[PDB]
Write a protein that binds this ligand. Structure first.
Ligand SMILES: N#Cc1cccc(C#N)c1-c1nc2c3ccccc3c3cc(Cl)ccc3c2[nH]1
Ligand SMILES: N#Cc1cccc(C#N)c1-c1nc2c3ccccc3c3cc(Cl)ccc3c2[nH]1
Ligand SMILES: N#Cc1cccc(C#N)c1-c1nc2c3ccccc3c3cc(Cl)ccc3c2[nH]1
Ligand SMILES: CCCCCCCCO[C@@H]1O[C@H](CO)[C@@H](O)[C@H](O)[C@H]1O
Ligand SMILES: CCCCCCCCO[C@@H]1O[C@H](CO)[C@@H](O)[C@H](O)[C@H]1O
Ligand SMILES: CCCCCCCCO[C@@H]1O[C@H](CO)[C@@H](O)[C@H](O)[C@H]1O
Ligand SMILES: CCCCCCCCO[C@@H]1O[C@H](CO)[C@@H](O)[C@H](O)[C@H]1O
Ligand SMILES: CCCCCCCCO[C@@H]1O[C@H](CO)[C@@H](O)[C@H](O)[C@H]1O
Ligand SMILES: CCCCCCCCO[C@@H]1O[C@H](CO)[C@@H](O)[C@H](O)[C@H]1O
Ligand SMILES: N[C@@H](CCC(=O)N[C@@H](CS)C(=O)NCC(=O)O)C(=O)O
Ligand SMILES: N[C@@H](CCC(=O)N[C@@H](CS)C(=O)NCC(=O)O)C(=O)O
Ligand SMILES: N[C@@H](CCC(=O)N[C@@H](CS)C(=O)NCC(=O)O)C(=O)O
Lengths: 148, 148, 148
């Protein structure tokens, strides 16, 4: 199997795929919140689900959308950086720590966001998760630059 | 050519690149709608195109933005999952079916969204397209986990 | 090192990683603008930073969010297209030109957006940067199609 192309790759693929699934869960929650609160973004949706007055914004829906957007701002770059980083021959344990800190940080972020936890809990989880991404980005920069 | 690294890879790259182009088409449509409806997000844009009163929201522009955002929520994860999945040695026909269902589902989604088709047509196309993504994610999870 | 899998790869990884870092910079700027202008998206944030009246929208915050969103609409597809394109054996100089035009175009876009430069400066930078992406997408299409 090509999952063995590098020792850090299986850990990366586990963490990344869990995070993609976590984003799908946010999307599912968002749809459920729209139905429950009867808050739809499109008139065609609203007319199917009770009438035109239900084409409206809702704070809980908007919160779900913010969580999903923040995921796109952070998890998508990780998918790129973590994949490349896996092939740079990092210490396997060090790489696992990068991926684990990101995974735990991001799951905590979603819990803090959707669960409306007091500030600055969410902000701290965001910052914690960005640390390994910054670290990987710099390592990739040096490796890329040195092969120019 | 490295497109032959795995039998499913060419089909994946065809479907993915078509979907990226499809997203670019949505971006082009969005700009055209902004010009036609004179609905700009930035005061500097509005002042070039008729005056400050044209820095305003428009329902058709917002609809285009929702379609593009939903594309980012779904197509970007597919780019990751489909790429990895291509290297896991899936049955070539089975893989083609995963990629084809996603491609057709997503093109239908954009048509349903921008064409304002009655509910739940768009919702069904979204769900249809998510099915192969869920399938690929689970397969990657097992492969990654088993190589830990 | 696996950065040498193809002659264009180091240049791609340099430009891509710089762009990911550039997006992180936009995220940092966004947070700084929220604090400075006291404009928070969440009531829990606002209550930590002065009171509920600071859960409010701000034009500069919204501008930062638009820049970041446009980055997600354009840089993320480049991460995919540029990576694949690097392995298609393009002329090294031609590939460097694709990556450089995208990098310069996108950095200019962010400067034009956040710096509120007169129209159509931002629009032109967007269009300039999309050109190499369109070029790469078409090349990938042909390579993928021909290996079906
Ligand atoms: N419009 C809309 C809409 C808008 C916002 C959230 C949701 C949700 N969750 C929906 C939503 N409604 C339906 C639906 C309604 C009636 C009958 C069937 C369906 C249906 C069937 C499938 Cl297979 C998949 C999804 C849906 C579906 N999604
Ligand atoms: N501002 C703005 C804006 C805002 C929203 C949508 C659109 C569109 N579509 C625009 C928009 N205006 C121009 C433009 C205007 C006058 C002269 C030249 C241009 C121009 C030239 C090139 Cl090469 C590329 C793009 C544009 C362009 N885009
Ligand atoms: N809520 C919120 C919020 C909302 C919008 C922008 C920002 C910013 N920038 C913030 C924000 N506040 C804090 C913060 C506040 C008090 C004490 C500590 C912190 C803090 C600590 C770390 Cl390690 C990282 C981030 C933060 C942080 N971020
Ligand atoms: C991966 C998906 C994670 C979902 C996290 C669910 C967090 C919801 O948690 C809930 O939040 C409510 C406020 O929203 C509170 O009223 C509840 O006390 C709390 O249980
Ligand atoms: C406030 C400062 C936090 C910024 C995060 C920096 C992340 C550190 O990352 C480190 O960078 C070094 C130099 O590039 C490398 O030698 C290390 O391998 C890398 O882990
Ligand atoms: C990849 C891009 C797909 C573009 C799909 C275009 C769908 C537009 O379709 C149009 O929608 C209008 C409402 O918006 C209707 O008034 C028209 O009858 C219909 O033709
Ligand atoms: C409502 C239930 C729909 C959820 C979508 C699940 C997608 C099924 O996906 C399947 O999962 C199996 C176990 O992981 C694998 O053996 C199969 O290869 C895979 O196709
Ligand atoms: C990668 C991050 C790029 C940041 C670009 C910063 C551009 C800010 O530039 C500033 O913009 C202000 C309006 O916003 C103007 O008042 C100032 O004259 C100008 O210096
Ligand atoms: C307004 C027209 C601009 C559209 C951008 C097209 C980008 C051109 O891209 C070119 O496409 C050719 C055919 O696919 C290829 O042979 C070239 O390698 C490629 O650079
Ligand atoms: N787009 C972000 C940029 C900065 C950021 O990501 N901040 C973190 C820590 S405060 C966050 O959780 N933002 C909430 C959000 O993006 O909705 C924002 O508007 O806040
Ligand atoms: N962000 C999505 C999460 C769920 C989702 O993707 N739903 C599908 C099926 S109803 C959709 O097409 N959403 C419309 C959209 O994202 O604007 C939403 O707000 O609806
Ligand atoms: N989502 C974009 C689609 C088209 C686009 O990307 N346009 C460029 C050139 S005008 C841009 O900079 N858009 C500003 C933005 O996305 O906020 C939009 O709404 O404008």
């Amino acid at each position: 199997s090509l999952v063995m192309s590098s020792p850090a790759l299986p850990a990366f693929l586990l963490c990344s795929t869990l995070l993609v699934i976590k984003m799908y869960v946010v999307a599912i929650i968002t749809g459920q919140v729209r139905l429950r609160k009867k808050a739809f973004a499109n008139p065609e949706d609203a007319l199917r689900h009770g009438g035109p007055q239900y084409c409206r914004s809702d704070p809980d829906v908007e919160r779900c959308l913010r969580a999903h957007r923040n995921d796109m701002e952070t998890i998508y770059p990780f998918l790129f950086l973590g994949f490349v980083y896996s092939f740079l021959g990092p210490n396997p344990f060090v790489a696992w720590m990068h991926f684990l800190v990101f995974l735990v940080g991001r799951v905590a972020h979603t819990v803090a966001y959707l669960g409306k936890l007091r500030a600055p809990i969410r902000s701290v989880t965001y910052t914690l998760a960005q640390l390994p991404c910054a670290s990987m980005a710099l390592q990739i920069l040096w490796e890329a630059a040195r092969h120019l």
